[PDB]
Structure 1
Amino acid sequence: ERKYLELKSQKNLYLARLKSAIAAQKIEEIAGNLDNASASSLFERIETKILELEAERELLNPPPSPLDKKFEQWEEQQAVEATLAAMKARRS
């Protein structure tokens, strides 16, 4: 009995270990299913999907070259400067 009671105790300790290991196994597999590192297919798949969908939207309305962006600003710079130059000079 002295041996059996000890043996009966160890399994309960060890039964926990397999339960802990059992729980310690499912955590990693699910992490690899979708990973923040994007190595997992799902995270990159959907993220790339956004990029796949993102690119097509831009082309349908071909964005004007950066020239007008600076020019529309520049002419705005000339416009705002000319307006404020006249306005500030109007009430300098």
Structure 2
Amino acid sequence: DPEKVLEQAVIDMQEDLVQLRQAVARTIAEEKRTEQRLNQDTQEAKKWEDRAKLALTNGEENLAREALARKKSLTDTAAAYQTQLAQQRTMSENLRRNLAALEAKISEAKTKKNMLQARAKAAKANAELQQTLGGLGTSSATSAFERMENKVLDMEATSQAAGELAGFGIENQFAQLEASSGVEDELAALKA
């Protein structure tokens, strides 16, 4: 059934955009976390170089080169974290583009299905006009007027029976009425 499916697909899209928002936020944490490290880390290199300068000021070359080893170790770690940062920023723009595209895709998928549904529903409504007009009144109502007309024609058949009866051999009874009508006309001839 259509409406169920089309709305369900749209429902799914609402989950998806939230999931990718989480992943974006997660990536923001990765950048924040690496910034926090790299910023401090690069200062730590300085701090141990400063500790080396204390040995320069006077005293222990052993401490001084030991402190270089700290500085080096930190420097190396910062290069690793700089590399990690490139992976974060690349993955971030990957999510960003994926999302922006997905959002447009979702948006139009929903909107097209809705306006399609609307025009499909409107189209079948127009077709249902033509169908209901095709539900013409040219019907068995004619047969009902006909049924009772078949009895009208039975009264006409009763009128054939009335005419079929109507001759009786008693028509001669009119004759003296006509003769006496002549008599009253002779009374008119008497009047003038």
TM normalised by structure 1 equals 0.52
Provide the residue aligned with 2:47 in structure 1: 52
Provide the residue aligned with 2:8 in structure 1: 8
Provide the residue aligned with 1:17 in structure 2: 17
Aligned partners of 2:11 and 2:22: how far apart in 1? 15
The superposition leaves residues 18-65 of structure 1 with CA deviations (integer Å, 9 ceiling, x where unpaired) of 221121110001211122xxxx3x2222211111100110231239xx
Q: Give me the CA root mean square deviation.
A: 1.9
Of the two structures, which has the highest relative contact order with CA contacts closer than 8 Å and spacing of 6 or more? 2
Q: Classify the secondary structure of the residue corresponding to 1:61.
A: helix
Aligned partners of 1:13 and 1:60: how far apart in 2? 64
Aligned partners of 2:51 and 2:24: how far apart in 1? 43
Q: Classify the secondary structure of the residue corresponding to 2:57.
A: coil
In structure 2, stretches of 5+ residues that fail to align are 59-192
Give the structure with higher Rg (CA).
2
Provide the residue aligned with 1:81 in structure 2: none
2:22 is aligned with 1:27 = no
How many residues align structurally?
58
- Deviation above 6 Å: which 4+ runs of structure 1? none
2:38 is aligned with 1:43 = yes
Higher helix residue share: 2
The superposition leaves residues 48-83 of structure 1 with CA deviations (integer Å, 9 ceiling, x where unpaired) of 1111100110231239xxxxxxxxxxxxxxxxxxxx
Aligned partners of 1:6 and 1:26: how far apart in 2? 31
Aligned partners of 2:44 and 2:9: how far apart in 1? 54
